[PDB]
From a paper:
We noticed that all residues on the [name] head domain, which were cross-linked by BMOE when substituted for cysteine, map to a relatively small surface area.
[name] subunits comprise an ABC ATPase “head” and a “hinge” dimerization domain connected by a 49 nm coiled-coil “arm. The heads undergo ATP-dependent engagement and disengagement to drive [name] action on the chromosome. Here, we elucidate the architecture of prokaryotic [name] dimers by high-throughput cysteine cross-linking and crystallography.
Author numbering:
A (entry chain A): 1 to 201, 973 to 1169
B (entry chain C): 143 to 212
């Protein structure tokens, strides 16, 4: 799967007029620093370059407030710019390049421009390429500030649509639409032949025409019947693929939640198991020694562990190219943060993980750590490899 | 809670700098060969740098890191 090699920021929020390059581990990167350092702006930068339209979602009041406003030693920027570099050696992107670069600029007048590997592109073209690579602009794998609350307040219908997507049943809806088109034409042709037969009811002429119409009708009726069977089959297969997906993720979710919350347990619930597509997807969890609660009623740490168990339940079934977390630890003590970080580190063999944090227990598990600090109203970064650090210090222990 | 450990590390940085006058290698500041302690030392320095009490110097990405008090 593709992964993020680096992110380049220029004139974006607290990042000044000199381009700042943020490199990433293929596995687990932690983005760390003081609150107020600009470390969280890196999350907003990724939402931005992947096409985010909502200033609030990028922690700004208007889109133009994403533009660096100047500092002690710097003038304001003419525009905000972010470029993201994906490794594409396995062609997760339908582009014949070992590297896919997406670049976005926004200007004080509020307009945005996009580039795909140096060539201009519309936002729609960018989203199409990200969809083809199964990279979401703001999907379930991106959990920034406020997104755990959003997942808690999410409707059961929206929650099921997430599983619909992961399961891949959209190909079945497509096949069904094409079969309904064929059925439509069959019915139109049947009604046409039926009108022509009614009118028909010189002997040789009328008998010839009646026999040819009766034969065309017989072919149309068989064609109609086989399309209806095909539609029935498609509907069964769609339900089957979805249920296989749901049951595996449901199992994952229960296991993971029991691991994050020792002595606890939880279940995914289909509001209509008989016809899943007529209802939502609900969540109930029972923390150790507490009553069964339903996810919308959950608070604090239980709420965050539940949302995280759901994310990892999906990533264990179908891993996304990357996951981007910020504020997921705000209501977790060190013991709980340890369990999440171990889960992240174990999953980071199959997906890229970027975690913005100042919790050292989360930090400890990372392959690389990007430290962010604000110098004179301008954010700057320092990069550290933990493997390299471990080796260098073990050798100094002599 | 943590403020005293960050301040302790600052005083260490300042005392060593008053004796050598030269930038201090990050590696020489890390008290244990354990990933959490490497991470915590790095973090405490980033806290100090965000407050303007030290400057962290790195020429190349993932290159040697040096510390100078301000």
């Amino acid at each position: 799967m593709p992964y993020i090699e680096k992110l380049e920021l220029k004139g974006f929020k607290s990042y000044g007029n000199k381009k700042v390059v943020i490199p990433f581990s293929k596995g687990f990167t932690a983005i760390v620093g003081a609150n107020g350092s600009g470390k969280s702006n890196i999350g907003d930068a990724i939402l931005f370059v992947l096409g985010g339209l909502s200033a609030k979602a990028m922690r700004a009041s208007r889109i133009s407030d994403l533009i660096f406003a100047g500092s002690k030693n710097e003038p304001p920027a003419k525009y905000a710019e972010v470029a993201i570099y994906f490794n594409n050696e396995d062609r997760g992107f339908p582009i014949d390049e070992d590297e896919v670069v997406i670049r976005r600029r926004v200007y004080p007048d509020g307009r945005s421009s996009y580039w795909l590997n140096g060539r201009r592109a519309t936002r729609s073209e960018i989203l199409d390429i990200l969809t083809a690579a199964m990279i979401s602009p703001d999907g379930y794998n991106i959990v920034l500030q406020g997104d755990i609350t959003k997942f808690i307040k999410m409707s059961p219908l929206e929650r099921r649509l997430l599983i619909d997507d992961i399961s891949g049943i959209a190909e079945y809806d497509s096949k069904k639409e094409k079969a309904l088109e064929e059925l439509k034409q069959a019915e139109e042709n049947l009604a046409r032949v039926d009108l022509l037969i009614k009118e028909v009811k010189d002997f040789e002429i009328v008998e010839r025409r009646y026999l040819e119409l009766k034969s065309k009708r017989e072919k149309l009726e068989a064609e109609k019947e086989s399309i209806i069977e095909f539609i029935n089959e498609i509907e069964k297969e769609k339900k089957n693929v979805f249920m296989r997906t749901f049951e595996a993720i449901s199992r994952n979710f229960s296991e993971i939640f029991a691991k994050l919350s020792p002595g606890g347990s939880a279940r995914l619930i289909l509001e209509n198991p008989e016809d899943p597509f007529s209802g939502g997807l609900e969540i109930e969890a029972k923390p150790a020694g507490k009553d069964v609660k339903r996810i919308e009623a959950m608070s604090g740490g239980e709420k965050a562990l539940t949302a995280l168990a759901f994310v990892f339940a999906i990533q264990k079934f179908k891993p996304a190219p990357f996951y981007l977390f910020d504020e997921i630890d705000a209501h977790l003590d060190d013991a709980n943060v340890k369990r999440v970080a171990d889960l992240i580190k174990e999953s980071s063999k199959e997906s890229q993980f970027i975690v913005i944090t100042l919790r050292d227990v989360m930090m400890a598990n990372a392959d690389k750590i990007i430290g962010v600090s604000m110098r004179d109203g301008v954010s700057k970064v320092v990069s550290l490899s933990l493997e390299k650090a471990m080796k260098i210090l073990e050798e100094i222990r002599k | 809670d943590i403020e005293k450990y960050v301040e302790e590390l600052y005083k260490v940085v300042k005392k060593i700098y008053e004796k050598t006058g030269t930038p201090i290698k990050f590696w020489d500041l890390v008290p244990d060969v354990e990933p959490k302690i490497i991470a915590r030392t790095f973090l405490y320095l980033l806290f100090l740098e965000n407050m303007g009490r030290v400057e962290i110097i790195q020429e190349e990405p993932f290159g040697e890191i040096l510390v100078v008090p301000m």
